[PDB]
Amino acid sequence: TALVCDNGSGLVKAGFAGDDAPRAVFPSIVGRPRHQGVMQKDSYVGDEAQSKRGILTLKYPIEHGIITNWDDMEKIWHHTFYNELRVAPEEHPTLLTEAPLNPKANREKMTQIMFETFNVPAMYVAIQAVLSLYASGRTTGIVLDSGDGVTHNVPIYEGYALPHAIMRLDLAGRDLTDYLMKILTERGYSFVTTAEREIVRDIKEKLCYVALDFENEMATAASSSSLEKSYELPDGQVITIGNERFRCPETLFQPSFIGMESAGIHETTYNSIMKCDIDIRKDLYANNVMSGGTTMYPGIADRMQKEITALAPSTMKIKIIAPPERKYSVWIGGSILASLSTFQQMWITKQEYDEAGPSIVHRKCF
Amino acid sequence: TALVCDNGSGLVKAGFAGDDAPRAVFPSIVGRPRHQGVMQKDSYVGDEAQSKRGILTLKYPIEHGIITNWDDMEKIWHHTFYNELRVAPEEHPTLLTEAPLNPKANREKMTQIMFETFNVPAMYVAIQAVLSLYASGRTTGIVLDSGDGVTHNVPIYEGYALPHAIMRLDLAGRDLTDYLMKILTERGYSFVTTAEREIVRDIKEKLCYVALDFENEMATAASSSSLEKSYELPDGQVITIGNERFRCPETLFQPSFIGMESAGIHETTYNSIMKCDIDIRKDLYANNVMSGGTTMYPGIADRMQKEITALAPSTMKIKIIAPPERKYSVWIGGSILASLSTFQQMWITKQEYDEAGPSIVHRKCF
Amino acid sequence: TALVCDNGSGLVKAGFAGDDAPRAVFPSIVGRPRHQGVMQKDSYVGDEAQSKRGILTLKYPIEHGIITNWDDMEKIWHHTFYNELRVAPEEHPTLLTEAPLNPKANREKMTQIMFETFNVPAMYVAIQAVLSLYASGRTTGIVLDSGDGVTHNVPIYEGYALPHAIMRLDLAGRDLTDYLMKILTERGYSFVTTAEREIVRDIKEKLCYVALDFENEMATAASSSSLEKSYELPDGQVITIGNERFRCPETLFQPSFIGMESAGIHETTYNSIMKCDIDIRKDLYANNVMSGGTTMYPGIADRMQKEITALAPSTMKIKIIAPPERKYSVWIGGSILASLSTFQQMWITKQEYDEAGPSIVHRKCF
Amino acid sequence: TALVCDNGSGLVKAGFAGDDAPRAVFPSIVGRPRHQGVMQKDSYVGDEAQSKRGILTLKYPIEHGIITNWDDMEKIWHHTFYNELRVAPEEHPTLLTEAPLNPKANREKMTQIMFETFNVPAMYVAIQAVLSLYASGRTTGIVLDSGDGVTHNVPIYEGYALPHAIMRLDLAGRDLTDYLMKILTERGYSFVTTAEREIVRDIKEKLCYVALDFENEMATAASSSSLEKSYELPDGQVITIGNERFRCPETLFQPSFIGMESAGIHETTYNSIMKCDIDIRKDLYANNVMSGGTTMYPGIADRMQKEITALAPSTMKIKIIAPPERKYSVWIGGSILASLSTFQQMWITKQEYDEAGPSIVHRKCF
Amino acid sequence: TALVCDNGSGLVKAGFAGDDAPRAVFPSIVGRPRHQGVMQKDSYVGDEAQSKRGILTLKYPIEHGIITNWDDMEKIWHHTFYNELRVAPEEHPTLLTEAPLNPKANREKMTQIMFETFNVPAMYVAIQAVLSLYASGRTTGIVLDSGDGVTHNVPIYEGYALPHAIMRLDLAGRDLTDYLMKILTERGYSFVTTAEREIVRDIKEKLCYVALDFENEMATAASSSSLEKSYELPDGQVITIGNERFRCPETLFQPSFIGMESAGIHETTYNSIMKCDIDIRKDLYANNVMSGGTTMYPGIADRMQKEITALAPSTMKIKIIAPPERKYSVWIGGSILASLSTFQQMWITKQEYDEAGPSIVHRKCF
Numbered sequence A, B, C, D, E: 001t002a003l004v005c006d007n008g009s010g011l012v013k014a015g016f017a018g019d020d021a022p023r024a025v026f027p028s029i030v031g032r033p034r035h036q037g038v039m040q041k042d043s044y045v046g047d048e049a050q051s052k053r054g055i056l057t058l059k060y061p062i063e064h065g066i067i068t069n070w071d072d073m074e075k076i077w078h079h080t081f082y083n084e085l086r087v088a089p090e091e092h093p094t095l096l097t098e099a100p101l102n103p104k105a106n107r108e109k110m111t112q113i114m115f116e117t118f119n120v121p122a123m124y125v126a127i128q129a130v131l132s133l134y135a136s137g138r139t140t141g142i143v144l145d146s147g148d149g150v151t152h153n154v155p156i157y158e159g160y161a162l163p164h165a166i167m168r169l170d171l172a173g174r175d176l177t178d179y180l181m182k183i184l185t186e187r188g189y190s191f192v193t194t195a196e197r198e199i200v201r202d203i204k205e206k207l208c209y210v211a212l213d214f215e216n217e218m219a220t221a222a223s224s225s226s227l228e229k230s231y232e233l234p235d236g237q238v239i240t241i242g243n244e245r246f247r248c249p250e251t252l253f254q255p256s257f258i259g260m261e262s263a264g265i266h267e268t269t270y271n272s273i274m275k276c277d278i279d280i281r282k283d284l285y286a287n288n289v290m291s292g293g294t295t296m297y298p299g300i301a302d303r304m305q306k307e308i309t310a311l312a313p314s315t316m317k318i319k320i321i322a323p324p325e326r327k328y329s330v331w332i333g334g335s336i337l338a339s340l341s342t343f344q345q346m347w348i349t350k351q352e353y354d355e356a357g358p359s360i361v362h363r364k365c366f
């Protein structure tokens, strides 16, 4: 059976092709002690690094979908195969994922490591937006994928991708976490260390939501306390946040909050549709597929529906597809793809790689 | 029973002899994907190519009544027999049509394909203007046939054709569509791709009409908005066109709008009558038969009546015959001809073709 | 003396009739601050916006030869008259230019602004391809004009234009810049903001060239590093680009690289010649005149000569005219035209405009 | 005339707008007797608390730029107006300062006290880094402000602040004093009380310096006694310190010495520049402005120049601006700002505060 | 086998590694005759000095964890090896202990004496709080060690020490004895000599306890005599003490009773936890480990539990670990450490000391 490994900027989703959910989901972090040991491993990965983060410096090897620090990324892959899935990598073909418009060397370097370090028999680097469409059972739609590092739009029509209309945005969950840390100082809460950033991410995933109308919610938050929620820190301290609950996800629709010049995810989706042929736009308007953890905010589908309806013509039916399992859509689609009989010819085997070279991995790639 | 296949530059009209209407009417297009497939046929024909045109490059195999690209034309014939009529070609004699003054190799090549690829038992290539006269139940008249690729005049008197008076004009519906695309840029509407050309053709067939007096309609369109009509594009955008509604069909009467030197269809009809013997002109003036989709513009019969009345002597009765079913007149006449008992001797059987050769197909041909 | 203002999608070329070069050449941009001012103009135009682009959002008012945002275009004209030429607009007749096949309202709106806002005594909107022919001292030739927004072919024979053979392509320099930004991500270089797009345009103008044979250059770039060039960014970072140097200009000959269906500039030029009368094609083959900044790539004249030679008959002499000053050919030709004695009757004065109306500006226009 | 009051975590700088130096500079301390009075005020402020600190418990109301203990802070403001400046607060508009990224309630509470307790006619809370740029006569630069409680970087370009690139570090002079107290125990010197902390601060300001290369200075200090300096305590005892002279300021560049995870001030400055637009980085590299008492260590400008030169590209000119009066740069800039004619509209008067409320004080604030 | 010698300010705990209790426990005193001998050693050490203290002047060589008088400390080590343990020092590696934040010369001087005077083969100076954690079988916790000279808090998490959060207080058992001597004069009891100080220490260890609520116990002691206890002096005199029983240990929680400015041991423990990372505070709250003779007061664990519960958040579980053998926790932990197999590489042998020098002894030291 094939391995499906979705290495994101934030989380590692790993499992076996054919299953309905990833078997191993853990943070893509490597932690190293930043104090003096007096009584003791050198590095910790994943959930083990998350439980001991109080004395660790946490580092993400993947930044904005791009693998920095190839030594730490190799520890995460080693932790995935031997400690989480408990399999021998040299027995299973491995399906990997990558964000579109990535550097060419990123895919070549991970292919060399999979073939020469873990000695996988075959491998394949899939398109993440294509996998999200497999998960929804569709062949047509524009995918809005937003994870921890990358937000990107990929329109697909009847199984054909339109690469010239692909949008990529280096604004995702980790930038929202950093912005939440900044605006929490307005209430006197100071989160600085990499371990405290993990606390702010937990606050974001539990209390943040997308406002249907931002300016009306700012007026409501300033006239009462009905939007105030409390949160207990790991040391028993209780913090209270008000308009920060919806100001943090609002950055997705107003990237100027963090100094970015790009347009919000609603205008980026609309601009991507308007670059497609006029004859396919009606089907794209009706199949806006959301995927990734950053699309899990309460109210983001209703907000996107409202924003795109205001940009599109009035006779168009805007339909946002947001399944409840969309946080694992890329992995679920990869599990479906790696199980298809027509896909078994797409594997890049170790033999083909020794003769063709690193250039064989850049086919059907954008 | 015999098959009647009217392969035009724009539409394929196919059916069985004896019926009153073609059973299969679909565009004569072959579409091929112009993007990358990621999730898938190689080519699409007819209405299937029209529904997926957003991701296809559409190509017409027939240009100006002449078959270019014989590989695509063979796919359209294959699509016609097996997917539209659902018959075995080797069981029915096939009646085909061709525009007059065509290259000799065009008819020879289609006869070789019908006999050696589809293995038809017998076939016959009819004269399209003769078929239009069969459809109107006449034996005398001058036929003005205008389709997607060819406009031609053929005078017939008491069943005898006058080939020296035949006029042919490579200005028809597809040139009007291209001219409409050009003058739509004056309002800021940009239609470029082959798929958008199909949209402009739909605009032409719904909103364009022939002005009775062109210069008076230009003054009316410039003094008010009573001639403005709106049209909703496939993506919900609404465009508004004014004098373009009658400027596009006006090219038929003023071919200089598209840089052509020839005279309009009214002067071409009159010049064709004036090349006929003086003793038959009175009967030709009273039997101007229109056929083809390009004669379906509202007001074109009243305009032709006015223009020819101004050219002919005042004592002549000018009568334009424009039946409501004239868009299928060639097929309807072919269905009538292929059902006649006196025609069953005109079939060119496979046996006669093996001994006589390609020269047998050029009898009663001009 | 008359003012000659060539308002392109990318650059403003302004000066006085009779001079040999434009006096004012600056980018056609309006910049507005996108941060918070704490210590301060509202908007910056041209080279002033280019020097402070780090804190500005840059916007082009002209897109694909069409003026969007008429408020920003009026600031550029105001910046041109009072800050660059330092003249009173109400004292000089102004010669303007426009791309062919433009919307009618574009020319009418700029005429209303010139007469009612700047109060020019007379004005004239010239044909850009006619001006390029004046600059080369020719009366016959097919002009290939390619700037920042529009690429168009206009054949002219003995002083007569053939409007039906005019080709227009909304693929020019700005689309090549956007494509270069996309393929620079393959090496890990991320240019996103409107200010970074100006950096990529500078990379394009310095390092990009047209390959004589594209597939052979791809093999050379993949077998060595002789095609690698370095470039120092404004912050001291040095980037290295290889095959992107000739892949970016190759889009002009293969518009499918950016998802466009149209043919390259070589086939468009050939198709334009083949729509002209057969008796003038020999003179058009010998007078292919290049103009505009996008024709300034090294090797584009040799590539066009090779591509058209392969399409034209072997007995035809293909001659590409590419003068070194062809980046200002439209302005230079306008300076020549506005100085002719026979042209002084072509000015549309303010008096003629008050009585005739906006319709007077659409004479000798296509 | 306006009052300029720079309330820092360590020192109060107060004076009149227009002067070149603060009139009143005294420690921001409140001292209360911790013994039994037998022969007698309740509390002492500033230099009076510093002279009697032997029998007092000294407390700073401001910690890390944030006002704790609002009763003690009100005594310091009262001591400033009536005992140091000897003015009536209800006659002069008061310019106050605050560190960036402070809690919103800190500024609101000090505005309420200034308007309702001291009854100032108008007031304004300025940005401290903007004032430091006014003091240096610049409109562009990245300010490194380091006082007793806060270290922060604020990049400013052409008068526009980039708030998203602002860095704040709760590591400043008071943390260096505490670290010096800790490492002085290695030589047997025990400083424990709040009065002895004032002695250690005096040792730091007289004997500590920044080493150009830290590891080479550690080797020099361990091989001889040329770096040993003596210091006479208030009771005549003489202490000798060696490598502690440069180990204490080294914490600014290696915050791990005190258990902090953040990067040093050199990497924080570089990271702040790298978050700014690429087009402004060259001007920021050349205008690194230092301000605050913690930048007064001998050799800190040469060390920062060396550290940033190693991080920046080699073609960049790194220039550290460290004027001799930079310990009062915030006050000097505030005196310049409060004297500008264009600033007299920025005052928040008592009338505007009664109607708008506390929300009026958070304009042009970050 | 290794020797474990815990040289405290008050008691010497010496024995062999592997045993469960120290073999030799005697006071760290040197006594010299202060009268005239008429009928006779020069100095007495330990229990021999304690039995003849009536005619001796008793002196502690160690003050506040720091060795003063190195001649007397060498007599105590000599008395320990040859008279108490009866071993040859040159045959056993010796594990020594030291209080944190001690002068560097203290450890260097005792290492020189152990290697050059007693000629031990190897030695090691351990961290006393680490040893107390070994004794409790824990790897996580904050140790509150309070002996005769030093009180210190050391937080340890998962075997990693946080040195920046270490608190040290020069207030311990000997200061409580001196305070008891002072408040015993209120009842007319005069203890002055160094021999009478040993009597007061015996009173403290037998009658003193920690009040759960101090102000309520003062009211109870002033309203009855239920808290009065009697004590028989060595000469048969009986003294009675009331509120002095709990006023003496109360100094640990209110150091102002003896003129010290520092906070009590409960606030010092809480302040140490609040300097640790927020993610480890919950585990530190549940593992407050007590060690040392000064933690042996009845009721001190219940008082510390009550005081820290009032400072910590209500959702935190405060657990004070006070084992009955905690007076020897440092020695017991040292016996465990010196028996570990992984520790046998940590010994500093005589050979390593001759080449590396005194600097080798300051590794893993704070």
Ligand SMILES: Nc1ncnc2c1ncn2[C@@H]1O[C@H](COP(=O)(O)OP(=O)(O)O)[C@@H](O)[C@H]1O
Binding pocket: A007, A008, A009, A010, A011, A012, A146, A147, A148, A149, A150, A172, A173, A174, A201, A204, A205, A206, A291, A292, A293, A294, A295, A296, A297, A327
């Ligand atoms: N319930 C939630 N609400 C908001 N954000 C969430 C939620 N759950 C996860 N996220 C965010 O999603 C991001 C990671 O999702 P994922 O799609 O796995 O990213 P990647 O694949 O790039 O690692 C994280 O930054 C996390 O903060």
Ligand SMILES: Nc1ncnc2c1ncn2[C@@H]1O[C@H](COP(=O)(O)OP(=O)(O)O)[C@@H](O)[C@H]1O
Binding pocket: B007, B008, B009, B010, B011, B012, B146, B147, B148, B149, B150, B172, B173, B174, B201, B204, B205, B206, B291, B292, B293, B294, B295, B296, B297, B327
């Ligand atoms: N209602 C209509 N009005 C105007 N033009 C029409 C209409 N219907 C069809 N046409 C035009 O008729 C042309 C095709 O008619 P047809 O006679 O079938 O041509 P052919 O036989 O050459 O394919 C097309 O170009 C189409 O645009």
Ligand SMILES: Nc1ncnc2c1ncn2[C@@H]1O[C@H](COP(=O)(O)OP(=O)(O)O)[C@@H](O)[C@H]1O
Binding pocket: C007, C008, C009, C010, C011, C012, C146, C147, C148, C149, C150, C172, C173, C174, C201, C204, C205, C206, C291, C292, C293, C294, C295, C296, C297, C327
């Ligand atoms: N040396 C060069 N090489 C390639 N492209 C160039 C060069 N110089 C200018 N260009 C391109 O030419 C375009 C503008 O030329 P121009 O003819 O002035 O356009 P317009 O008139 O439409 O503004 C710009 O997009 C610029 O990138």
Ligand SMILES: Nc1ncnc2c1ncn2[C@@H]1O[C@H](COP(=O)(O)OP(=O)(O)O)[C@@H](O)[C@H]1O
Binding pocket: D007, D008, D009, D010, D011, D012, D146, D147, D148, D149, D150, D172, D173, D174, D201, D204, D205, D206, D291, D292, D293, D294, D295, D296, D297, D327
């Ligand atoms: N000569 C000096 N060398 C080193 N540090 C100094 C010197 N003079 C002052 N300082 C430090 O500067 C700090 C206060 O400077 P300042 O900028 O006034 O801080 P704040 O404005 O936050 O009160 C004090 O902590 C002091 O120790």
Ligand SMILES: Nc1ncnc2c1ncn2[C@@H]1O[C@H](COP(=O)(O)OP(=O)(O)O)[C@@H](O)[C@H]1O
Binding pocket: E007, E008, E009, E010, E011, E012, E146, E147, E148, E149, E150, E172, E173, E174, E201, E204, E205, E206, E291, E292, E293, E294, E295, E296, E297, E327
């Ligand atoms: N039962 C007791 N109650 C209160 N204090 C005690 C008791 N037993 C011993 N002590 C005190 O503990 C101190 C010494 O304990 P220890 O931890 O051995 O100190 P050190 O290791 O510094 O010598 C002495 O000052 C003694 O008075």
Ligand code: BEF
Binding pocket: A007, A008, A009, A010, A064, A065, A146, A147, A148, A149, A150, A151, A172, A292
């Ligand atoms: F890397 Be994640 F998909 F943003």
Ligand code: BEF
Binding pocket: B007, B008, B009, B010, B064, B065, B146, B147, B148, B149, B150, B151, B172, B292
């Ligand atoms: F081919 Be159609 F009849 F113009």
Ligand code: BEF
Binding pocket: C007, C008, C009, C010, C064, C065, C146, C147, C148, C149, C150, C151, C172, C292
């Ligand atoms: F507007 Be430019 F001439 F493309």
Ligand code: BEF
Binding pocket: D007, D008, D009, D010, D064, D065, D146, D147, D148, D149, D150, D151, D172, D292
């Ligand atoms: F409060 Be100081 F400016 F650090």
Ligand code: BEF
Binding pocket: E007, E008, E009, E010, E064, E065, E146, E147, E148, E149, E150, E151, E172, E292
């Ligand atoms: F020296 Be003891 F441990 F206070």
Ligand SMILES: [Ca+2]
Binding pocket: A007, A008, A009, A128, A147, A148, A292, A330
């Ligand atoms: Ca992902």
Ligand SMILES: [Ca+2]
Binding pocket: B007, B008, B009, B128, B147, B148, B292, B330
């Ligand atoms: Ca036809």
Ligand SMILES: [Ca+2]
Binding pocket: C007, C008, C009, C128, C147, C148, C292, C330
């Ligand atoms: Ca131009």
Ligand SMILES: [Ca+2]
Binding pocket: D007, D008, D009, D128, D147, D148, D292, D330
């Ligand atoms: Ca300050």
Ligand SMILES: [Ca+2]
Binding pocket: E007, E008, E009, E128, E147, E148, E292, E330
């Ligand atoms: Ca001890």
